[PDB]
């Protein structure tokens, strides 16, 4: 508990990774034409956040 921080037609993309005790997040947003699978094309994700937290992540879960 030693840390806290605050700040189908749409595709939201993200990347999450942990390196050298820093936990990094990236993203991109776009409209899409066909919702049945990820659209074949290219548009790179850009960083949002680079957290100092030092945690050993091995598993994850999602909320809705």
């Amino acid at each position: 508990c030693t840390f806290e921080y605050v700040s189908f037609k749409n595709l939201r993309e993200f990347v999450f990774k942990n390196i050298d005790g820093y936990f990094k997040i990236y993203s991109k947003h776009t409209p899409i034409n066909l919702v049945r699978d990820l659209p074949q094309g290219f548009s790179a994700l850009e960083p949002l956040v680079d957290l100092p937290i030092g945690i050993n992540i091995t598993r994850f879960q999602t909320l809705l």
């Binding site: 030693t2 005790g21 030092g54 945690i55």
Partner: peptide, 22 residues
């Protein structure tokens, strides 16, 4: 003083195994 104690880069782990210094 018993309040100061010991057991990847910049990792932290509070799980338990711990000993104070003397």
């Amino acid at each position: 003083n018993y309040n100061y104690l010991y057991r990847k880069p910049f990792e932290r782990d509070i799980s338990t195994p711990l000993q104070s210094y003397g």
